[PDB]
């Protein structure tokens, strides 16, 4: 549900339930941002749909993990400026169990640290 | 007919040619200043390409 920050007092949770059913169509997804109001602003999202470029069976196992992270869902409003509440906008292409869907990265525009939200899941059957 | 204009485009001018002849290249020059700015209406600052594999 929740993961804490590394730099600020910001915490990220998803108001909609982290196990959810959908077909290959569109779906609504909703994220909590609660922080301290000393600089309550300037975060950005991006989903980063590219392959992390990376034993031979593990050598084709890490690639097939990454080639379904970066090909499964697409975020239909990336670079979303946040200002608390935001409804992030995805559609998924191919089906499976996308537990800890880990592409999406928010980032603080001052002192750029790659904050990750490795939470939530989506079955597509 | 502005559709393909760079963002540094900010002015125009028209050196009109005023001809008169019998058998001669006897002309003049007539020049106009024109200032015009741009409505930056819509922009596509990024693109990316995703393939697919599911039959819907």
Swiss-Prot record, chain A:
Localisation per UniProt entry: Cytoplasm; Golgi apparatus, cis-Golgi network
Coiled-coil stretches noted in the UniProt entry, renumbered to this chain: none
Domain of life where this protein originates: Eukaryota
Signal peptide: none
Self-association state and partner proteins as the record states: Part of the multisubunit TRAPP (transport protein particle) II complex composed of BET3, BET5, TRS20, TRS23, TRS31, TRS33, TRS65, TRS120 and TRS130. Interacts directly with TRS120 and TRS130.
Function: Specific subunit of the TRAPP II complex, a highly conserved vesicle tethering complex that functions in the late Golgi as a guanine nucleotide exchanger (GEF) for the Golgi YPT1 GTPase. TRS65 plays a role in the YPT GEF activity of TRAPP II in concert with the two other TRAPP II-specific subunits TRS120 and TRS130. Involved in cell wall (1-->6)-beta-glucan synthesis.
Note: Present with 1660 molecules/cell in log phase SD medium.
Name used for this protein in its record: Trafficking protein particle complex II-specific subunit 65
Native source species: Saccharomyces cerevisiae (strain ATCC 204508 / S288c) (Baker's yeast)
Gene for this chain: TRS65
Span of the entire protein shown here: 401 to 559 of 560
Curated annotation (Swiss-Prot), chain B:
Source domain of life: Eukaryota
Protein location: Golgi apparatus, cis-Golgi network
Physiological role: Specific subunit of the TRAPP II complex, a highly conserved vesicle tethering complex that functions in the late Golgi as a guanine nucleotide exchanger (GEF) for the Golgi YPT1 GTPase. TRS120 plays a role in the YPT GEF activity of TRAPP II in concert with the two other TRAPP II-specific subunits TRS65 and TRS130.
Quaternary state and interactors: Part of the multisubunit TRAPP (transport protein particle) II complex composed of BET3, BET5, TRS20, TRS23, TRS31, TRS33, TRS65, TRS120 and TRS130. Interacts directly with TRS65.
Extra facts: Present with 259 molecules/cell in log phase SD medium.
Family statement: Belongs to the TRS120 family.
Protein's UniProt name: Trafficking protein particle complex II-specific subunit 120
């Amino acid at each position: 549900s929740l993961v804490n920050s590394k730099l600020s007092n910001v915490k990220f949770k998803f108001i909609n339930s982290n196990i959810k059913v959908i077909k290959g169509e569109k779906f609504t997804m909703r994220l909590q941002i609660i922080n301290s109001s000393s600089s309550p602003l300037d975060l950005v999202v991006y989903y980063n749909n590219t392959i992390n470029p990376i034993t031979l069976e593990n050598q084709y196992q890490l690639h097939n993990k990454y080639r379904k992270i970066a090909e499964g869902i697409i975020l239909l409003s990336n670079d979303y400026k946040i200002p608390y509440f935001a409804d992030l906008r995805f559609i998924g292409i191919m089906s499976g169990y996308y537990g800890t869907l880990s592409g999406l990265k928010v980032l603080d525009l001052n002192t750029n640290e790659l904050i990750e939200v490795g939470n939530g899941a989506s079955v597509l059957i | 007919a502005v559709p393909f204009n760079f963002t540094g485009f900010d002015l125009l001018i028209e050196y009109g040619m005023s001809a008169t002849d019998e058998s001669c290249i006897y002309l003049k020059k007539l020049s106009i200043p024109y200032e015009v700015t741009l409505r930056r209406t819509i922009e596509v600052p990024s693109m990316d390409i995703i393939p697919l594999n599911e039959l819907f």
